[PDB]
Amino acid sequence: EENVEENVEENVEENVG
Amino acid sequence: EIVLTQSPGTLSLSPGARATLSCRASRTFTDTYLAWYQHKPGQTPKLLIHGASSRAPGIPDRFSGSVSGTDFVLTISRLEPEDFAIYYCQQYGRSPRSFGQGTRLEIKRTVAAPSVFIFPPSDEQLKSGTASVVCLLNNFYPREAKVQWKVDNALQSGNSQESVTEQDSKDSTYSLSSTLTLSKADYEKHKVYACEVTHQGLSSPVTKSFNRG
Amino acid sequence: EIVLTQSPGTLSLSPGARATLSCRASRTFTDTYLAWYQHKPGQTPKLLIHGASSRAPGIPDRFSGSVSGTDFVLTISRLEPEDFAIYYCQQYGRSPRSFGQGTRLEIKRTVAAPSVFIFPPSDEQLKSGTASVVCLLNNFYPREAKVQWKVDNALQSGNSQESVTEQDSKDSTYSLSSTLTLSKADYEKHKVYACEVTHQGLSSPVTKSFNRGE
Amino acid sequence: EVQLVESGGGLVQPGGSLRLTCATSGFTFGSYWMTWVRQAREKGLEWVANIRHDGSETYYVDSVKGRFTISRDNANNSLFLQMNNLRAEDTAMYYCARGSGGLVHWGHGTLVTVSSASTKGPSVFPLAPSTAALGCLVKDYFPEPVTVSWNSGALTSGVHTFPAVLQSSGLYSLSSVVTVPSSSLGTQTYICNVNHKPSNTKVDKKVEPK
Amino acid sequence: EVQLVESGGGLVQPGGSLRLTCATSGFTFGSYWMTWVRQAREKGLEWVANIRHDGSETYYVDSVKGRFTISRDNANNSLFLQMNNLRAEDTAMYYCARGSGGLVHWGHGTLVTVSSASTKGPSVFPLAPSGTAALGCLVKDYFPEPVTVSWNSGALTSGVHTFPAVLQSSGLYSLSSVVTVPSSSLGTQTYICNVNHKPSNTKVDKKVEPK
């Protein structure tokens, strides 16, 4: 319960550049 | 990144009342990896609620949490004298697992007036090469106050520092002290020094002053 | 714009080996918006690595990812028998958020022998107008195998199709099946049919046959 | 409990149109990006399109630009992929996935087939045994898929249902076999259960020695 | 019992280094994520870094990237925080906590002070008087914290307000203590504030007389 892993960022905006 | 902003800045309630503390995010919440912490000055921080709505072991039942949309709320049903502290929310789903800026939960009482005093700089410090004037505010409520320095009635800024005590364990009031500091040469350059105090318990800005050059 | 190429296409290693799966780009990566997937047959793909070097929640310690320059590598430190499937990389910072072509991971195993069988066409199919003969290879390793159709004794070509299963989870072997499809007339022009199976794990070509064809 | 259920897939002729729908539950649909991913037969995974949580941005793979349209109804928890002017190479299994980065939650997918051929039910033929092996020949059906089970799901060991093969006529055919000891040549009955939902075909074929 | 003990850290100059150690016991160390958290004066709690159970993944807050390094030795039950190129804004109390989510078990916390200032004792000045009467002592220009203040060797403890110190631009702390008394004990009773500054071994006793 104390070991929260690095969760996924599921809302990735579009990158420009 | 998702930024957590807590509301209100300072919460003023009396023992036995119902407390509601907010924690709003930059975007809509998408998980339950949220926590509430209690922190008293000089004491170790303490977890109250994890998983947005689960009480940590040992936490009394009067603490409950819930998350909905863009607001993350901590609820204290009836305020115990041991509950007045600083409260931080936190997200821990992924990096950065940042906290909120904090909410000060103070005790509510009747409006009191600050008994303002003033002290001229002692001659012992003048021999060093500097002078510092002090303006005292004693036992008042609420914590909000504003003092100004006007050397020869000319608004002074960028040369003062203020300090506030904790809420008294009996009077439930605060105490403020502003220290104006300027060069010894700039001290004898003028003659009239004063500090104006503005507070709710004051019908008009009182000004205890001195004129010793 | 930027395309991803996974090397190799097929990779064969023993259990407990160290797997180094590569995913190269046309130009050097400018972000860590890369991922790795594991696609086992019959299930949906499973996210393994996100952010180029972070494990997804619930992913064991042996899976790890890293990126440097133009190489995006997934590492499986100790290959367990279950960690054998198809692996795709993916970019997801900019559209098109495309995958690579994928890399198959095969389990190495001691060479096994194909127990060859044969099946004649049923009379129910004969009255329909066509005839299908089935040659079965059950549980064999490796995948390389050669199956020929021998109507009487003249070699047949251009009239059969083969279908290979995938590696079993228990046996870690394969299974092949060739189907000789000929018209009812050509099934009447001859009488004897046989499939000769030549396999590396076979000391000699095994030939299971049937007669009564007409 | 994140649920993604695709629908609207089936058999369509070249140039026809088809509308895919992804019903969602277990999360706030309007808070996430959504993505469509397809995989063709014996091909790799292909990203098709994605859409912003508010529907203000849509992106597509080049092969579908001008023909496919992704959209959403945040009030109905539904995601749509309008497919127009369908080419044969658009035949694949189409998957619904939440988000736009590392795809964690996937749907089960719906099969979209683009061909001029008509729906045909399969012909199930026995494979007579002579240890011993026996099977069933599921021949000439369209479109995919076909599901085969032995003894109503009782024989789950040693069974190998081979993947389908596309024949010259444009129809599919597969075979499912299972190995058994010769002691059960007559004392145990062996019946293969074949189901082809695209044509509502269900066949229970008993395999007997010749 | 879960035990977390932070050690290391202290006074350092800008650009200096400090290595924090969090010696743990009472639980399987290599089975838990570990986290560093800090809190600076007059500011809120700040999440700094955490590390996976096997140390294969580390994450940091932006302000410490490239300068701080979190590490662990699972055979020694020790969590580390190598702090390089320290800044004045790094001055805070540093806690180590178990896990990576809701932090239940905290350590007591160690204090890290980063400043170009040097050790200096305070200069005590009086705040002479001139309802009741107000008097006090101005404890000015000392480094580092803290300073203890008492009145009449601890006999006058009621009505005394010792403020929290303010950090001046020069890098030195300034303190003011006050007390209110009636005008009856103005000339009869003599009031002497007792100032103690241990990091400089400076003890000052100044009498405040009404002028």
Method underlying the structure: X-ray
Same domain for B32 and B124?
Answer: no
Lookup: tokens for B96: 């950065």
Q: For chain D, what is the largest distance between any 2 Cα atoms, rounded to a whole number of angstroms?
A: 67
Touch between chain D and chain B: 3 or more Cβ pairs under 8 Å:
yes
Cβ–Cβ contact B94 with A under 8 A: yes
Contact C90, C34 (CB under 8 A): yes
Contact state of C94 with A15 under an 8 Å Cβ cutoff = yes
Q: Closest to B92 (Cβ–Cβ): which among E61, E101, E174?
A: E101
Minimal C-alpha gap between C57 and chain A (Å): 6
Cβ–Cβ contact B60 with E under 8 A: no
Q: For chain E, what is the largest distance between any 2 Cα atoms, rounded to a whole number of angstroms?
A: 71
Percentages (nearest 5) of helix, strand, coil residues in chain A: 0, 0, 100
Contacts of E among chains (3+ CB pairs under 8 A) = A, B, C
Q: Which of E54, E100, E29, A4 is nearest to C62 (CA)?
A: E54
Compute CA distances C127 → C131, C132, C135, D138, D194, whole Å: 9, 12, 21, 16, 21
Q: Name where chain C breaks: residue before each gap, C-N > 2.5 Å.
A: none
- Kindly report the length of chain D: 210
Contact B95, A6 (CB under 8 A): yes
Contact D156, D122 (CB under 8 A): no
Minimal C-alpha gap between D46 and chain C (Å): 6
Question: Whole-angstrom Cα distance, residue E150 to residue E161?
Answer: 10
CA–chain centroid gap for E186, Å, is 36
Contacts of C among chains (3+ CB pairs under 8 A) = A, D, E
* A8 vs B contacts (CB less than 8 Å): 94
Strands (E), E8-88: 11-12, 18-25, 34-39, 45-51, 58-60, 68-73, 78-83
Lookup: tokens for D36: 């469509």
Q: Name where chain B breaks: residue before each gap, C-N > 2.5 Å.
A: none
Which residues between 93 and 122 in chain C have a beta carbon less than 8 angstroms from any beta carbon of chain D? 95-102, 115, 117, 119-122
Contact state of B119 with E136 under an 8 Å Cβ cutoff = yes
H-helix or E-strand spanning residue C102: none
Give the DSSP per-residue string, D78-122.
Answer: EEEEEE-S--GGG-EEEEEEESSSS---B---EEEEE-SPPPBPP
Question: Whole-angstrom Cα distance, residue C67 to residue C21?
Answer: 12
Which residue in this structure is represented by tokens 């049903």?
A: B77
* Domain hosting residue C44, numbered range: 4-107
- The end-to-end CA distance of chain A, in Å, is 40
Q: What is the DSSP letter of C36?
A: E
Rg (CA), chain A: 13
Contact B11, E11 (CB under 8 A): no
Contact state of D27 with B28 under an 8 Å Cβ cutoff = no
Q: Name where chain D breaks: residue before each gap, C-N > 2.5 Å.
A: 130
H-helix or E-strand spanning residue C125: helix C123-126
- The residue type of B138 is N
Cβ–Cβ contact C27 with A under 8 A: no
Question: Whole-angstrom Cα distance, residue B54 to residue B51?
Answer: 6
Contact C17, C79 (CB under 8 A): yes
- Kindly report the length of chain E: 211
Question: Whole-angstrom Cα distance, residue C134 to residue D127?
Answer: 8
Same domain for B170 and B85?
Answer: no
Question: Whole-angstrom Cα distance, residue E84 to residue E67?
Answer: 5
Minimal C-alpha gap between E26 and chain A (Å): 16
Return the number of CB contacts < 8 Å for A and E.
27
Question: Whole-angstrom Cα distance, residue C13 to residue C77?
Answer: 12
- The residue type of C114 is P
Lookup: tokens for E175: 């303190």
* E47 vs B contacts (CB less than 8 Å): 90, 96-99
Lookup: tokens for D140: 């000439």
Contact state of C50 with D101 under an 8 Å Cβ cutoff = yes
Question: Whole-angstrom Cα distance, residue E33 to residue E112?
Answer: 23
Minimal C-alpha gap between A10 and chain D (Å): 5
Touch between chain D and chain E: 3 or more Cβ pairs under 8 Å:
no
Question: Whole-angstrom Cα distance, residue D92 to residue D40?
Answer: 4
Give the DSSP per-residue string, E108-156.
Answer: --EEEEE-S---B--EEEEE-----EEEEEEEEEEBSS--EEEEGGGT-
Give the DSSP per-residue string, C39-58.
Answer: E-TTS--EEEEETTTEEPTT
With a CB cutoff of 8 Å and minimum separation 6, the contacts of C77 are C18, C61, C62, C64
**HSE toward the beta carbon, residue D200, CA cutoff 13 A:** 0
3-state SS assignment for residue C159: coil
Contact E132, E30 (CB under 8 A): no
Kindly report, as residue ranges, where domains of CATH 2.60.40.10 are found in chain D.
Answer: 3-114, 123-207
Contact E12, E67 (CB under 8 A): no
Give the residue from C87, C107, C127 where a domain finishes.
C107
Q: Write out the residues of chain D at the interface with chain C, using a CB-CB cutoff of 8 A.
A: 35, 44-47, 50, 59-62, 95, 100-104, 106-109, 123, 125-128, 130, 133, 135, 137, 139, 160-165, 167, 173-175, 177, 179, 210
**β B4-7/B10-13 pair status:** unpaired
Same domain for C103 and C119?
Answer: no
Contact E143, E192 (CB under 8 A): no
Contact state of C134 with D135 under an 8 Å Cβ cutoff = yes
Strand order in the sheet with C19-25: C4-7, C19-25, C71-76, C63-68
Question: Whole-angstrom Cα distance, residue B109 to residue B76?
Answer: 19
Compute CA distances E186 → B134, D144, E134, E182, E190, whole Å: 20, 103, 10, 7, 8
Choose from C2, C38, C119 for mutation: most chain D CBs within 10 A: C119
Same domain for C119 and C66?
Answer: no
Same domain for C132 and C102?
Answer: no
CATH label of the domain that carries residue B161: 2.60.40.10
Question: Whole-angstrom Cα distance, residue E174 to residue E165?
Answer: 5
Compute CA distances A10 → C55, C87, D100, E66, E90, whole Å: 14, 20, 6, 27, 33
Contact B34, B9 (CB under 8 A): no
Cα dihedral B167, B170, B171, B175, rounded to 10, equals -40
3-state SS assignment for residue E201: coil
CA–chain centroid gap for D147, Å, is 10
3-state SS assignment for residue E96: strand
- The end-to-end CA distance of chain C, in Å, is 61
Question: CA angle, corner E196, sides to E193 and E202, nearest 5?
Answer: 120
Strand order in the sheet with D78-83: D3-7, D18-25, D78-83, D68-73
Cβ–Cβ contact C77 with E under 8 A: no
Question: C99-126 burial string, b = 16+ CB within 10 Å, else e?
Answer: bbebbbbbbebeebbbbbbbbbbbeebb
Minimal C-alpha gap between E27 and chain A (Å): 13
Cis peptide before E182 (omega within 30 of 0): no
Strands (E), C62-205: 63-68, 71-76, 86-91, 103-107, 115-119, 130-140, 146-151, 154-156, 160-164, 174-183, 193-198
- The residue type of C50 is H
Cβ–Cβ contact B90 with E under 8 A: yes
Same domain for B103 and B123?
Answer: no
Question: Whole-angstrom Cα distance, residue D204 to residue D191?
Answer: 6
**β D110-114/D11-12 pair status:** parallel
CATH fold of D123-207, please? Immunoglobulin-like (2.60.40)
Q: Closest to D179 (Cβ–Cβ): which among C138, C164, C179?
A: C138
Contacts of A among chains (3+ CB pairs under 8 A) = B, C, D, E
Lookup: tokens for C16: 């407990």
H-helix or E-strand spanning residue C5: strand C4-7
CA–chain centroid gap for B118, Å, is 23
Long-range contacts formed by E50-58: CB under 8 A, 24+ apart: E50/B97, E50/E100, E51/E79, E52/A5, E53/A3, E54/C61, E54/E30, E56/C61, E56/C64, E57/A6, E57/C53, E57/C54, E57/C55
3-state SS assignment for residue E46: strand
Which residues does residue D4 pair with via DSSP β-bridges, in sequence order? D24
Same domain for B36 and B78?
Answer: yes
CATH of E3-114, one of 2.60.40.10, 3.30.360.10, 3.30.560.10, 3.30.70.1450: 2.60.40.10
Phi, psi of E30 (to 5 degrees): -70, 5
Same domain for B141 and B183?
Answer: yes
Cα dihedral B6, B7, B9, B13, rounded to 10, equals -130
3-state helix/strand/coil string of chain B: CCCEEEECCEEEECCCCCEEEEEEECCCCCCCCEEEEEECCCCCCEEEEECCCEECCCCCCCEEEEEECCEEEEEECCCCCCCCCEEEEEECCCCCCCECCCEEEEECCCCECCEEEEECCCHHHHCCCEEEEEEEEEEEECCCCEEEEEECCEEECCCEEEEECCCCCCCCCEEEEEEEEEEHHHHHCCCCEEEEEECCCCCCCEEEEECCC
Which residue in this structure is represented by tokens 């608004």?
A: B155
Question: Whole-angstrom Cα distance, residue B210 to residue B208?
Answer: 7
Contact state of A10 with D59 under an 8 Å Cβ cutoff = no
Question: Whole-angstrom Cα distance, residue C131 to residue E192?
Answer: 117
D157: exposed, middle or buried (C-beta count within 10 Å: 0-12, 13-18, 19+)? exposed
Lookup: tokens for B102: 């904090």
Q: Which of C141, C143, C153 is nearest to C111 (CA)?
A: C141
Contact E196, E139 (CB under 8 A): no
Give the residue from B81, B107, B133 where a domain finishes.
B107
Contact state of C53 with E54 under an 8 Å Cβ cutoff = no
Which residues does residue B90 pair with via DSSP β-bridges, in sequence order? B35, B99
Kindly report, as residue ranges, where domains of CATH 2.60.40.10 are found in chain E.
Answer: 3-114, 123-208
Contact state of B30 with A9 under an 8 Å Cβ cutoff = no
Strand order in the sheet with E148-151: E148-151, E191-197, E202-208
Contact E8, E19 (CB under 8 A): yes
Which residue in this structure is represented by tokens 């004898």?
A: B188
CATH fold of E123-208, please? Immunoglobulin-like (2.60.40)
Contact C55, C49 (CB under 8 A): yes
Same domain for B204 and B137?
Answer: yes
Contact D47, C97 (CB under 8 A): yes
Strand order in the sheet with C193-198: C154-156, C146-151, C193-198, C206-210
Same domain for B161 and B205?
Answer: yes
Compute CA distances C101 → B162, C163, D47, whole Å: 66, 22, 12
Q: Which of C32, A6, E4 is nearest to B91 (CA)?
A: A6
Lookup: tokens for C116: 């060859």
Question: Whole-angstrom Cα distance, residue E180 to residue E52?
Answer: 55
Question: Whole-angstrom Cα distance, residue B41 to residue B34?
Answer: 23
Same domain for B119 and B91?
Answer: no
Give the residue from C107, C124, C145 where a domain finishes.
C107
Choose from B163, B168, B209 for mutation: most chain E CBs within 10 A: B163
D57: exposed, middle or buried (C-beta count within 10 Å: 0-12, 13-18, 19+)? middle
For residue D12, count other CB atoms closer than 10 A to its CB.
17
Same domain for C102 and C130?
Answer: no
Contact D85, D15 (CB under 8 A): yes
Lookup: tokens for C213: 């064809």
Q: Which of B67, B61, B30, B29 is nearest to B48 (CA)?
A: B61
Contact state of B102 with E95 under an 8 Å Cβ cutoff = no
Compute CA distances B129 → B121, B123, B124, C176, D64, whole Å: 12, 10, 10, 99, 80
Contact state of C125 with D125 under an 8 Å Cβ cutoff = yes
* E52 vs A contacts (CB less than 8 Å): 5
Number of separate domains in chain B: 2
